[PDB]
């Protein structure tokens, strides 16, 4: 809690969970990042930008590649199609 409560005030902290030996729970493929953008570029997404000027929010998210596709992190190569 203390992490977020400071973060809300306008001053965020970084990497504190690295040595704390406690990470908040998240499903497979993701673990807790800090200050990920809400507009997670997913798999079946339109490539538009500079509308998501929202503030930055903490939470768990995929690795660098491994785009989101239906609640899991899957590699960008295997983005399916839909019909």
């Amino acid at each position: 809690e203390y992490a977020r409560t400071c973060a809300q005030e306008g001053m965020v902290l970084y990497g504190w969970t690295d040595h704390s030996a406690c990470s908040p729970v998240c499903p497979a493929g993701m673990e807790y990042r800090q200050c990920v953008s809400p507009c997670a570029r997913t798999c079946q997404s339109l490539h538009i930008n500079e509308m998501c000027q929202e503030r930055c929010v903490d939470g768990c998210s995929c690795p660098e590649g491994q785009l989101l596709d239906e609640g899991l992190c899957v590699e960008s190569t295997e983005c399916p199609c839909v019909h």
């Binding site: 507009c39 079946q44 339109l46 538009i48 509308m51 989101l68 839909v82 019909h83």
Partner: protein, 196 residues
Amino acid sequence: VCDATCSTIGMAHYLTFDGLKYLFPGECQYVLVQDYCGSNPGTFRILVGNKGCSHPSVKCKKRVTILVEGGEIELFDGEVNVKRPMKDETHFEVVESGRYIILLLGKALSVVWDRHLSISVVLKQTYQEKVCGLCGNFDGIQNNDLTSSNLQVEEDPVDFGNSWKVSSQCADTRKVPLDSSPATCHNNIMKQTMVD
């Protein structure tokens, strides 16, 4: 060839350039029309966003964000707002005349807004298949306006506009069962005649 015209007749209906009325109740933000389509520079990115507008009512106040010349001018709630002025101000123009907000943006682009819901963008002879979105491609062919963002024609428009939402994680709309009577006129044959 003349100057075509999108439209939003009512809350959830859409008329294409080539002319194709179709039904699409949405609640997310959607790409009405743009230029960034396939193999193009992508000058303008007119968007539209409705809220509480799957069922038409006194709700469904629209929001419109139009993205041209690296600017951010948008409108809703009666007035227009400049969030980011664009570079070439010379082409910019606003004509608040009568009931409308006539709004030019260039040589071959113009927007009209009834202050309430309607969005009637007007494009010139310039493009001729250089755009895509919910209004189709502006090619003259009238039965290829449902070419989804994944580059295939779809038969069912409710799946189409789902392909054109911006936030790719919001709620896509629901395939409604087809009938001649909306919710109120459903099994309300009396009212159904008076409305008729």
